[PDB]
């Protein structure tokens, strides 16, 4: 009984941990995409911006 | 739902970026052509211009 309720609580902690890491991975990739989008936008702002070389 | 609307906005940004780059490429080539036309015109202005060697 002690091992089963211990293991159950630990399993709950494992599930929570995994869910949070899955979230973090999703958020990390969309930030990479938005960063790359910003970089692309900057290069167009440069070439098609004002005057210069 | 969050991933789909995020991805949709990012896809819109990608489409806009690509359209602007396609435009830039078109404009770049017609400028190369007009530059080369000007250079050709200059060589005729030289040979068939005034006096000299
Ligand atoms: N004569 C110019 N006109 C506009 N931009 C220039 C010029 N010369 C250089 N730049 C470059 O283009 C960028 C224009 O600044 P930015 O804030 O993007 O323009 P805006 O304030 O109109 O959005 C600057 O970072 C600068 O490095
Ligand atoms: N005697 C000359 N008459 C005309 N052009 C000359 C003469 N000697 C040299 N050139 C060259 O030909 C060019 C004539 O100048 P340009 O402004 O093209 O003529 P226009 O003002 O009649 O259009 C000059 O760049 C110059 O280098």
Angstrom CA distances, A8 to A4, A19, B27, stand at: 6, 17, 66
Q: Which class for B42: exposed (0-12), middle (13-18), buried (19 or more C-beta within 10 A)?
A: exposed
Pick the residue from chain A with its C-alpha nearest to B15: A37
Q: Cite the DSSP H helix spans in chain A.
A: 2-47
Burial letters B5-24, b for 16+ CB under 10 A, else e = eeeeeeeebeeeeeeeeeee
Characterise A22 by phi-psi region: left (phi > 0), alpha (psi -120 to 50), beta (else): alpha
Cβ pair A37:B17 closer than 8 A: yes
Cβ pair B10:A37 closer than 8 A: yes
Q: Which class for A5: exposed (0-12), middle (13-18), buried (19 or more C-beta within 10 A)?
A: exposed
In chain A, residues with a C-beta closer than 8 Å to the C-beta of B3 are: 26
Tokens encoding A51 = 């005057």
Distance B52 CA to ligand 2 centre (A): 9
Task: Tell me if A39 sits within 8 A of B13, measured CB to CB.
Answer: no
Cβ pair A48:B24 closer than 8 A: yes
Task: Tell me if B19 sits within 8 A of A43, measured CB to CB.
Answer: no
| Residue B45 Cβ contacting ligand 2 at under 6 Å | yes
Reported as type and span, the H/E element at residue B39 is helix B2-47
Distance A2 CA to ligand 2 centre (A): 104
């Amino acid at each position: 009984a002690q091992q089963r309720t211990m293991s159950e609580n630990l399993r709950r902690n494992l599930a929570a941990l995994e869910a949070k890491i899955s979230e973090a991975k999703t958020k990390k990739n969309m930030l990479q995409a938005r960063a790359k989008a910003a970089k692309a936008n900057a290069e167009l702002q440069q070439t098609l911006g004002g005057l210069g070389t």
